[PDB]
Structure 1
């Protein structure tokens, strides 16, 4: 089991082509096929209301992490309110748009290919402990200090365990999102 830590102060802001905001890539699988990535973690800055790009064949789970929330319109809609730290799953082929009813928003974005990855996502707080055989475990901090696997994650830092091949026993303290990804087949 290899531990890597992604520090948010090292993230690179990539403005969107449409000027509606920007993306900070955190990490992703190798995923270099014409098929593309198997999974990707990023933080999206959403600066103005607008539509979301499509990602046919991918599952998305997004979570507001900065800002008071925003409203989403998914396909044929009831409008969905996204509050801070409330994750929201939707298919990547859905037509989705957001309205920034309180100002600009930052989302924590998980996207993965159901064909290629098993996936688990859970926001947690306090002291947590889990056992997992998942190949990749990610811990994304939204606190000043999330302690996990001997590391201290600051704000939007992300710890990544890779190449797990046994049962990991992981304790976490603090407000963070736990993601577990395992290659299928």
Structure 2
């Protein structure tokens, strides 16, 4: 139905309050409410070790997309290593800090409200084909050319399908992340 292509050359980089990194917003839900937000997609540049903000009540899934990896500590559990393209889910409630090992990292970030949205996320490669009733489908490229729905996405470009109301049949070729989001009733 309604296809949008977010080109990474258009993303606006915004320094974090604290000076330790910056965020490029890709896209997000269209709600307005003072009552919290529904879902947001972004790229975070992490330039220093330190603590992350918390987002109480939200679910997060983050993935290293540039640089060699970093280590997270979540709620003082044992340290966890994040390698490139390995997705990692955690609660926004959690207290989280990051230790850079090889220097700065860029992360692909999904955050959503589980009260408000159903969600799916999967990193894929090669030739893929799926059918989905999801209202919003997102395709985020980590390759020079990901082909999807007649568009060609370069590195960190993102295709978005919105307002779907039947069963979508989507083929994708290349290395990318597939996200699907649907408002809960």
Classify the TM-score, shorter chain.
over 0.9
For residues 11 and 79 of structure 2, the distance between their equivalents in structure 1, rounded to whole angstroms, comes to 32
Q: Work out the CA distance in 1 between the residues paired with 2:82 and 2:183.
A: 29
Query: Any idea what SS the aligned residue of 1:55 has?
Result: coil
- Is contact 1:31–1:39 with CA below 8 Å preserved after alignment? no
So what's the TM-score if we normalise by structure 1?
Answer: 0.99
Give the aligned partner of residue 78 of structure 2.
78
For 1:32 and 1:85, the matched residues in 2 are separated by: 32
Equivalent residues in 2 for 1:13-162 (5 A)?
13-162=13-162
Kindly report the root-mean-square deviation, in angstroms, between the aligned alpha carbons of the 2 structures. Answer: 0.5
Following the alignment from structure 1 to structure 2, what is the Cα–Cα distance between the partners of residues 36 and 9? 29
4+ runs deviating over 6 angstroms? none
How far did residue 3 of structure 1 move?
Answer: 0.3
SS in 2 for 1:24: strand
Is the contact between residue 122 and residue 178 of structure 1 (CA under 8 Å) also seen in structure 2? yes
Q: Is the 8 A contact 1:129 1:170 kept in 2?
A: yes
Per-residue CA deviation, residues 151-181 of structure 1 (Å, 9 max, x unaligned), is 0000000000000000000000000000000
TM-score where L is the length of structure 2 = 0.99
Matched, 1:175 2:172: no
Q: Which moved more, 1:28-37 or 1:86-95?
A: 28-37
Q: Partners in 1 of 2:96 and 2:35 — Cα distance?
A: 22
Per the TM alignment, residue 76 of structure 1 is displaced from its structure 2 partner at its CA by 2.8
Deviations 1:107-147 (A, max 9, x none): 00000000000000000000000000000000000000000
Extract unaligned runs of 5+ from structure 1.
none
The question of whether the paired residues in 2 share the 8 Å contact of 1:24 and 1:43 is answered with yes
